[PDB]
């Protein structure tokens, strides 16, 4: 429906890419509860849209998201905490984060929840939760550490210091850096490529990669094998291999 | 043995390095079932050869291995796959295995290199997991070892698009530890295998087992296992000789015992 | 007490940083049992000193620590061993390692036990245990691998080869590289920053980041959440978020 | 309102939310519609401040004979690949009062509950194998973890059923009561849980569940963090003071 | 053919692969030669399309009294660090019919089996401690996971034996039968399993085993993936249809 | 020189270190001072070359009624973030002879022990919930792992107690003895253990403990490494030889 905090729209060839834009410039995209609710709606919608194969999440040019909404948490109590934030992780289709500008606190964690992260030349990542007398509460101490290593993760989480796009890429937090002006376009091109592939196979691949963080290498490889065997129960695997053998373009039907 | 797809031979000082070279150039070293069987044979042989301390696995200059053999699985069914189950044997080898990757190391080829303990890349090597382009996903640790070495963002990008990354990219990301000119790559990998072979076999096997454990348990339990293995080295003659040699300011004489 | 192998002292703004300096220059700071005992004492002392918020551990300019003391284990037997080295991991306050020069074997492991590692331009890391007929025995095969990746870790552990500061940073083993002359000063500045934040919250954050190596991503995020909720039971969380909302400097009380 | 389930509050001061599966015709076979209502009832009781614990039960002859086979009969692999365990998202304790058949999906639903009380004639089993499939809702995970590999393999591979007595001896269920008083007894247990601090009860339940998600070392660390957390509540202060002051504790779920 | 074991096809349609340890003089002490033949028999039965389940047993006096001490007596540490668990690579179900002694390596072998049936006079134990060593084939892992820490510690640290009734009560074994009919009963169970779809049975067995290799959360996710997989088979379709059409299922193992 | 505990060496050759909690007035409430002495006694017995196993017990009426409520009553959340399980750092086996009450911290202490023997009238429980808190020393972890989720949830959420018979049936304790002979019997078991090689016993105990810290696969690998290690000891050679030579083994703890 008519969204208050986000702007959605389909893009790329055949409009196969679902674009979600955080639109709360006043608050530098502070992830207030309302914005989160709309974001989850947009994600669910694009997830159920058969023409969409990949989603691109972005914010403004100055800020992807400055964090969660302090104003909204300010008066919460411990007990409140014990009486929605990671719905993006339940989405089966790939989600690419096009990070331009600030991606701090909850904003940084939201980007890390995405499968792939592309950063604009002037993006900035950080977990300033410590400066607010709290710690990251949406995977900031988990996903950051796993991607960047203990030393840098400890430095960022304990001081609240920010790192550049170049630092993030070097550390493995993000895989590409693009000029501010073309960042979103480039992320859409990548989303396109992914959308071109079979949707069912892409979902299986994404699930396999994610498993790398939930089990031992041994069990991860076993799960990957089971999923690999599964692709053989699909038409697109048959079509993909035949196309290869027949040296012709493959025609995937997401089935 | 009389191999059809691979070329083996001992190299390095005292012929301590076992060199296995994938040899199916017309198929750019596509890993067909027959080649896999010979590779495993060569590995087992070098493993049982007491003169060998480390193995170097390589392919051609244009390709380490362009991938599994699609033509061989193109007709398989789900039931075939399940009710039919050896791609991972190289992981059962106790001696270190170094992959000297020159050119293409894609799909199964990339996974094979990642199964190796160390990876050295030639200036023009290329890594990628194009399984997605074939309507399938990596099936030999491609989504596990790549991710663990390269991080989620790059791993997702590669696995989901099938895009390739350069040798420089792979090194920067931690997939490979060294990059050498195409012409000297294999020589350099042999030098490293030699250094490793110089050490005590038994101790080297324990160390390799310890490092591998870093991917199978919590840091806490990993450190405990490492401790047990560390204590174990004290039950060997080489440990004694090694420390004695250092204290006595003289060269160590290891006997792999 | 009056230490024989280490030099301690408080530094940074308001002497909030506890500096421990390994001082056995003749043995290139080889980690003998006596030095380890003093180091543990210094750590415990700084841990219990209310004025200290972070500790900086360093050695000489030529060597952080050349390794454990070989002569001391030279005559030990397997039964000796099976029937203290990592107490530094029991410290709740952050510990930063300012590595200048050699950080080999036990020295490298000690540095890796620290939360953050800063390296001087000429630092060198390596695990030469293999050259002595033994393997790293204080997390060298675990922390190195987890930070540097399997390929480089195997190369280092199996050959005993050393890597440069630049290599270590690129691989994620250390997060910063500074000139030899200012390295310790820079690490103290980082410790200062950490010490200005809430001690209790900092301890929780450090615990959260460390958990990234002890459980699946799913459970790690759950633990992080519980710790996040916990911060709400503190005065500093309330002051931190209030200060932000009221556009004013936060005054933490480590409570 | 509900077509497949019957809900109602019970116990002291109506602190117990009782959900009763009601599709006697199909022996409470868990069809998609019933699952949707069950989840609703659960969410409702979860949000009801008056409720401290939930009791889930079915009929006297069957808790739930299994998922609805006719509903999946024609599904294909792609349909599948493209919530039956929402009960696991509930923070308040859920007790399963199993009378009669608790097979397949029914057995898995009971195992998803925190506590299981079985009527004298209850029967547990995972017959999915007889249908050319395997348990798909934790049947091979929760059963094994509670009963051990030998018995779990026997049940899953043959589809054989085990008695209430077997289930109790194996640790699948913690109590066995006469068919007629089973539900009443489960409600008494839920009452007791409801009398304790909700916030503390939620933390304890989360701690016990963690025993299946991490190593003992990390589990103990998490438990410690939760233990420290209780000190941030009024109920913990009240509970310990009441003890020291030899008086009854008055919890406020805060 | 074989020196230490006796194999033969049993059960309806010869669907059961029976392997019998045959080293009576050494009370089936698991020497290296016997292990090699056992692995051969397993591989053979595994590749035999007519076999759906394997039953492993020994004599009436002893399933297997332990590894062969004589064989390791002279080994050194270095020797040790320079295929005991092959039975674990078999995809088809393996039932252990334990009669008499199942000690040390013998106990571990039985524990490696998916299901364990014990004769009235079976005896389990891990006496490795009495020999100056510890169980080296999962004795401290599988025993503990099945029996609990207290009893496992007692057995491993003292070398004490437990009865068939103790083993069953503790969950080590799921059934106890008279010595004379034990093997027959295990074959009947193997028959039942063999009757079901081989591919689905292999998936189920893999799912149950996963209960010991990952957190409940990941185990449930793996089980789900395998569950979806069954939908890519003809047997699942046949199984569910047969139920719906109230008729007998004809599985074709695919 | 102990105020809260009574120690003394018992059994053949004074091979068993017996520690008796002695604060009958407080039903052995584990106050901080008692914990400090307990740890001292443990460390002492651990360093005593003549001791091979420790037996921990309390009074006939109570092993330990819990941690000291009076001592934590005034603690704050912040205090909590400013050596309760040191018994777990002891390499030699520790047997808990539980007579009477073993509640809360007391129950957790018993569970930290390697083996638990219970007197006919022992009682186990985790009443932390009744005090507005949750078990904080492994009560939700070790209890669950030994007793299963259903019973563990029941105990932790209601604070209800279970009998010795219940505890044994659930696997929490491995033996039940009359109140009067319980400690004697536990000492006999400690004797047996102390009979074997101390170095090998330490390795075995470490192996069994690993069953709760890693996947079955890695646990088996660790066990293997420990198994190989035993071959680097004289006691293993002595043990195997003694068996081969049909003679009694003479262990020298190395
Ligand atoms: C499960 C539940 C979730 C838990 C997850 C983890 C916890 C967190 O995410 S906490 C968030 C951490 N983020 C922060 O501390 C960042 C706060 N913001 C900043 O530091 C600055 O805005 C910064 C550096 C990005 C840019 O500074 P600047 O260019 O001067 O812009 P600035 O004027 O501060 O911001 C503009 C407006 O956005 C608002 N805003 C910015 N960030 C936030 C935020 N995180 N919450 C609420 N409002 C915010 C500002 O208050 C201001 O509004 P106004 O002037 O009307 O009060
Ligand atoms: C349970 C606890 C677990 C144990 C943990 C794991 C095991 C380990 O840590 S073993 C450590 C491995 N490290 C080594 O072998 C490195 C030894 N050091 C070196 O090789 C060199 O000192 C190096 C390369 C750093 C610098 O070279 P260089 O500048 O020429 O110095 P160099 O002349 O070799 O040595 C100078 C002095 O330092 C001493 N020293 C340096 N490292 C050590 C050491 N590890 N042990 C003992 N003495 C040492 C030397 O003995 C020598 O003293 P002296 O002349 O009186 O005999
Ligand atoms: C993530 C997605 C979830 C995945 C989870 C795992 C998979 C599963 O749960 S599959 C379910 C396994 N369950 C079964 O195979 C049990 C099927 N039922 C039975 O065996 C018998 O009903 C039994 C033994 C319980 C009782 O027999 P009986 O007393 O004769 O009663 P019975 O006549 O069979 O049942 C009465 C009615 O209930 C129906 N019914 C019973 N169970 C089911 C069921 N599971 N699905 C659908 N309808 C069922 C019967 O079809 C019959 O209806 P009708 O005669 O109009 O067709
Ligand atoms: C890491 C930090 C550790 C965290 C671990 C987890 C948390 C816990 O352990 S909390 C402990 C939970 N235990 C309890 O709630 C049990 C409390 N006690 C009881 O319920 C009863 O004493 C019971 C049922 C055992 C016996 O009742 P009864 O026979 O009437 O004896 P009772 O009169 O109550 O006890 C005798 C004396 O011992 C004292 N006492 C008993 N238990 C405790 C205790 N846990 N703490 C302090 N004092 C205690 C009583 O206060 C009384 O002393 P006094 O009359 O002078 O004040």
> CA C228, CA A134: separation in Å to the nearest integer?
7
> CA E115, CA E136: separation in Å to the nearest integer?
21
User: Can you tell me which residue has the tokens 């080994």?
Assistant: E75
* 3-state secondary structure (DSSP) of residue C228: helix
User: Can you tell me which residue has the tokens 């909720």?
Assistant: C229
E253 touches chain B (CB under 8 A): yes
Q: Residue F157: which of D191, D47, D222 has the closest Cα?
A: D191
Domain that holds residue B122: 1-199
> CA C215, CA D156: separation in Å to the nearest integer?
29
User: CA dihedral defined by D153, D157, D160, D166, rounded to 10 degrees?
Assistant: 0
* 3-state secondary structure (DSSP) of residue C178: strand
Q: What is the CA radius of gyration of chain A?
A: 19
Instruction: Please say whether the beta carbons of A206 and A195 come within 8 A.
Output: no
Instruction: Please say whether the beta carbons of E136 and F227 come within 8 A.
Output: yes
Q: Residue A124: which of A161, A97, A159, A88 has the closest Cα?
A: A161
> CA E128, CA E136: separation in Å to the nearest integer?
9
Q: Which is it for strands A163-164 and A124-126: parallel, antiparallel or unpaired? A: antiparallel
* 3-state secondary structure (DSSP) of residue A16: coil
Domain count for chain D = 2
Q: Residue F141: which of E103, D215, D81, B194 has the closest Cα?
A: D215
D-chain CB neighbours of B223 within 8 Å are none
Residues C77 and C176 in one domain: yes
How many residue pairs from chains B and C have C-beta atoms closer than 8 A?
Answer: 156
Q: Residue B255 C-alpha to ligand 2 middle, in angstroms?
A: 23
Half-sphere exposure of E116 (CA within 13 A, CB side): 32
Contact at CB, A255 and D78, closer than 8 angstroms: yes
Q: At what angle do helices C235-245 and C199-210 cross, to 10 degrees?
A: 100
Q: Residue B139: which of A238, A223, A235, A217 has the closest Cα?
A: A223
Retrieve residue D54's tokens. 């939930």
Residues B215 and B150 in one domain: no
User: Can you tell me which residue has the tokens 């079976």?
Assistant: E122
Burial class (CB in 10 A: 0-12, 13-18, 19+), D47: exposed
Instruction: Please say whether the beta carbons of C148 and B174 come within 8 A.
Output: yes
Measuring from each residue's beta carbon to the nearest atom of ligand 4, which residues come in under 6 Å? F 26-27, 29, 65-70, 84, 101, 103-105, 108, 127-128, 131, 135-137
Beta bridge partners of D102: D64, D124
Q: Residue A23: which of A71, A65, A68 has the closest Cα?
A: A65
Domain boundary among A164, A197, A230: A197
> CA B138, CA B110: separation in Å to the nearest integer?
10
> CA E230, CA E223: separation in Å to the nearest integer?
11
In chain C, which ranges are continuous DSSP H helix?
33-48, 70-73, 78-82, 106-113, 143-148, 150-159, 165-171, 183-196, 199-210, 217-230, 235-245
User: Can you tell me which residue has the tokens 């819990």?
Assistant: F66
Q: How many angstroms separate the most distant Cα atoms in chain E?
A: 65
> CA C205, CA D216: separation in Å to the nearest integer?
22
CB atoms within 10 A of CB C56: 29
> CA D186, CA D202: separation in Å to the nearest integer?
19
Instruction: Give the ligand 4 atom nearest the CA of F103.
Output: 13
> CA B136, CA B154: separation in Å to the nearest integer?
19
Q: Residue D95: which of D36, D177, D200 has the closest Cα?
A: D177
How far from chain centre, in Å, is Cα C191?
A: 12
A21 secondary structure, DSSP code = E
Q: How many angstroms separate the most distant Cα atoms in chain F?
A: 65
Measuring from each residue's beta carbon to the nearest atom of ligand 3, which residues come in under 6 Å? D 26-27, 29, 65-70, 84, 101, 103-105, 108, 127-128, 131, 135-137, 139
DSSP A177-226: EE-TTTHHHHHHHHHHHHHHS-HHHHHHHHHHHHGGGTS-HHHHHHHHHH
Q: Which is it for strands D123-125 and D101-103: parallel, antiparallel or unpaired? A: parallel
Instruction: Please say whether the beta carbons of A39 and A6 come within 8 A.
Output: yes
> CA F190, CA F204: separation in Å to the nearest integer?
15
Q: Residue C161: which of C153, C169, C171 has the closest Cα?
A: C153
E strand segments, chain D: 5-10, 16-21, 53-57, 62-64, 94-98, 101-103, 115-119, 123-125, 162-163, 175-177
E181 secondary structure, DSSP code = T
Beta bridge partners of E116: E96
Retrieve residue C75's tokens. 């005559």
Beta-carbon contacts of E141 under 8 Å, excluding residues fewer than 6 positions away, are F207, F210, F211, F216, F219, F220, F223
> CA E17, CA E22: separation in Å to the nearest integer?
16
Residues C123 and C9 in one domain: yes
Nearest CA to ligand 2 atom 51: C27
Beta-carbon contacts of A234 under 8 Å, excluding residues fewer than 6 positions away, are A198, A200, A201, A255, B135, D77, D78
> CA E106, CA E83: separation in Å to the nearest integer?
15
A23-32 burial, b for 16+ CB within 10 Å, e for fewer?
A: bbeebbbbbb
Experimental method reported for this structure: X-ray
Catalytic residue among B59, B60, B103, B108: B108
Catalytic residue among E108, E119, E137, E239: E108
Residues F132 and F249 in one domain: no
Retrieve residue E51's tokens. 């076999």
Phi, psi of E94 (to 5 degrees): -125, 120
Contact at CB, C226 and D225, closer than 8 angstroms: yes
Find the discontinuities in chain C where C to next N exceeds 2.5 angstroms and give the residue preceding each.
83
Instruction: Please say whether the beta carbons of B93 and B128 come within 8 A.
Output: no
Instruction: Please say whether the beta carbons of C223 and C54 come within 8 A.
Output: no
Retrieve residue E42's tokens. 């397993």
Beta bridge partners of C56: C19, C96
Q: At what angle do helices E198-210 and D149-158 cross, to 10 degrees?
A: 150
CATH of the domain at A152: 3.90.226.10
Contact at CB, F218 and B221, closer than 8 angstroms: yes
Ligand nearest to the Cα of D140, by number: 3
> CA A30, CA A37: separation in Å to the nearest integer?
13
Closest-CA distance of chain E to residue A134, Å: 28
Selected residues 178-197 of chain D with any CB under 8 Å from a CB in chain E: none
Domain boundary among D169, D196, D223: D196
Phi, psi of C125 (to 5 degrees): -115, 145
Sign of CA dihedral B189, B195, B197, B200: negative
DSSP chain B: ---SSEEEEEESGGG-EEEEEE--GGGTT-B-HHHHHHHHHHHHHHHH-TT--EEEEE--SSEEE--B-HHHHTT--HHHHHTT--TTGGGG--S-EEEEE-SEEETHHHHHHHHSSEEEEETT-EEE-GGGGGTS---SSHHHHHHHHH-HHHHHHHHHH--EEEHHHHHHHTS-SEEE-TTTHHHHHHHHHHHHHHS-HHHHHHHHHHHHHTTTS-HHHHHHHHHHHHHHGGGSHHHHHHHHHHHTTS-------
Beta-carbon contacts of F36 under 8 Å, excluding residues fewer than 6 positions away, are none
In E118-215, which ranges are continuous DSSP H helix?
139-147, 149-158, 164-170, 182-195, 198-210
How far from chain centre, in Å, is Cα D18?
A: 12
Instruction: Please say whether the beta carbons of D238 and F69 come within 8 A.
Output: no
E175-177: strand order across its sheet? E5-10, E16-21, E53-57, E94-98, E115-119, E175-177
Beta-carbon contacts of B249 under 8 Å, excluding residues fewer than 6 positions away, are none
> CA B105, CA F224: separation in Å to the nearest integer?
35
Residues D235 and D136 in one domain: no
- First-to-last C-alpha distance (Å) of chain D: 33
List chains adjacent to chain C, taking adjacency as at least 3 C-beta pairs closer than 8 Å.
A, B, D, E, F
Instruction: Please say whether the beta carbons of D132 and E248 come within 8 A.
Output: no
Best residue among D30, D66, D123, D125 to mutate for probing ligand 3's pocket (most ligand atoms within 8 Å of CB) is D66
Query: Which residue ranges of D make up the annotated binding site?
Result: 67-70, 105
Closest-CA distance of chain C to residue D212, Å: 10
A223 touches chain E (CB under 8 A): yes
CA distances from B177 to B227, C100, C104, C154, C186 (A): 26, 23, 19, 9, 29
Residues E104 and E1 in one domain: yes
Phi, psi of A230 (to 5 degrees): -60, -40
Instruction: Please say whether the beta carbons of F52 and F22 come within 8 A.
Output: no
> CA D145, CA F145: separation in Å to the nearest integer?
9
Beta-carbon contacts of F180 under 8 Å, excluding residues fewer than 6 positions away, are none
Residues A210 and A182 in one domain: no
Retrieve residue D49's tokens. 């401040």
Beta bridge partners of A13: none
Residues E104 and E59 in one domain: yes
Residues D125 and D32 in one domain: yes
Instruction: Please say whether the beta carbons of D17 and D55 come within 8 A.
Output: yes
Assign residue F132 a region (left: φ > 0; alpha: ψ between -120 and 50; beta: otherwise).
left
Residues A204 and A186 in one domain: no
- Resolution value in angstroms: 2.4
> CA A18, CA A16: separation in Å to the nearest integer?
7
Q: Which is it for strands B118-122 and B97-101: parallel, antiparallel or unpaired? A: parallel
Beta-carbon contacts of E131 under 8 Å, excluding residues fewer than 6 positions away, are E69, F236, F239, F240, F242, F243, F249
CA distances from C234 to A137, A158, F80 (A): 15, 17, 12
> CA A105, CA F132: separation in Å to the nearest integer?
33
Residues E223 and E105 in one domain: no
Burial class (CB in 10 A: 0-12, 13-18, 19+), E16: buried
> CA A148, CA F55: separation in Å to the nearest integer?
48
> CA A30, CA E70: separation in Å to the nearest integer?
73
C111 touches chain A (CB under 8 A): no
Domain boundary among B156, B177, B199: B199
CB atoms within 10 A of CB F3: 10
CA distances from D116 to D107, D150, F149 (A): 10, 21, 9
Q: Residue F250: which of F189, F195, F190 has the closest Cα?
A: F195
A128 touches chain B (CB under 8 A): no
User: CA dihedral defined by D208, D153, E210, E134, rounded to 10 degrees?
Assistant: 90
CATH of the domain at D226: 1.10.12.10
- First-to-last C-alpha distance (Å) of chain E: 33
Half-sphere exposure of C207 (CA within 13 A, CB side): 24
Residues C114 and C238 in one domain: no
User: Can you tell me which residue has the tokens 């002279």?
Assistant: E74
Per-residue 3-state assignment (H helix, E strand, C coil) for chain F: CCCCEEEEEECHHHCEEEEEECCHHHCCCECHHHHHHHHHHHHHHHHCCCCCEEEEECCCCEEECCECHHHHCCCCHHHHCCCCCHHHHCCCCEEEEECCEEECHHHHHHHHCCEEEEECCCEEECHHHHHCCCCCCCCCCHHHHHHCHHHHHHHHHHCCEEEHHHHHHHCCCCEEECCCCHHHHHHHHHHHHHHCCHHHHHHHHHHHHHCCCCCHHHHHHHHHHHHHHHCCCHHHHHHHHHHHCCCCCCCCCC
CB atoms within 10 A of CB C247: 6
Phi, psi of A43 (to 5 degrees): -65, -45
Phi, psi of F175 (to 5 degrees): -150, 150
Q: Residue C155: which of A188, E193, B98 has the closest Cα?
A: B98
Instruction: Please say whether the beta carbons of F76 and F161 come within 8 A.
Output: no
**Chain F residue closest in CA terms to D203:** F134
> CA B114, CA B132: separation in Å to the nearest integer?
18
User: CA dihedral defined by E235, E238, E244, E246, rounded to 10 degrees?
Assistant: -110
> CA A35, CA A5: separation in Å to the nearest integer?
5
> CA F110, CA F106: separation in Å to the nearest integer?
6
* 3-state secondary structure (DSSP) of residue E31: coil
How far from chain centre, in Å, is Cα C7?
A: 17
């Amino acid at each position: 429906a008519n969204f208050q905090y986000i702007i959605t729209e389909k893009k790329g060839k055949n409009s196969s890419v679902g674009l979600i834009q955080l639109n709360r410039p006043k608050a530098l995209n502070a992830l207030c509860n309302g914005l989160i609710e709309e974001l989850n709606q947009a994600l669910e919608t694009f997830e159920e849209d058969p023409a969409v194969g990949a989603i691109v999440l972005t914010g403004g040019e100055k800020a992807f998201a400055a964090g969660a909404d302090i104003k909204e948490m300010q008066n919460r109590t411990f007990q409140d905490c014990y009486s929605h934030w990671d719905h993006i992780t339940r989405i089966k289709k790939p989600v690419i984060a096009a990070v331009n500008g600030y991606a701090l606190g909850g904003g940084c964690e939201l980007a890390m929840m995405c499968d792939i992260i592309y950063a604009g030349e002037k993006a900035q990542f950080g977990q300033p939760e410590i400066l607010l007398g709290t710690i990251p509460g949406a995977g900031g101490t988990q996903r950051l550490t796993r991607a960047v290593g203990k030393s840098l993760a400890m430095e960022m989480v304990l001081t609240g210091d920010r790192i550049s796009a170049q630092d993030a890429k070097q550390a493995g937090l993000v895989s590409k850096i693009f000029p501010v002006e073309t960042l979103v376009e480039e992320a859409i091109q990548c989303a396109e490529k992914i959308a071109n592939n079979s949707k069912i196979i892409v979902a299986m691949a994404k699930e396999s990669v994610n498993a790398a963080f939930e089990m031992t290498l041994t069990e991860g490889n076993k799960l990957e094998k089971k999923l690999f065997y599964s692709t053989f129960a699909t038409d697109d695997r048959r079509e993909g291999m035949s196309a290869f053998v027949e040296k012709r373009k493959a025609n995937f039907k997401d089935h």
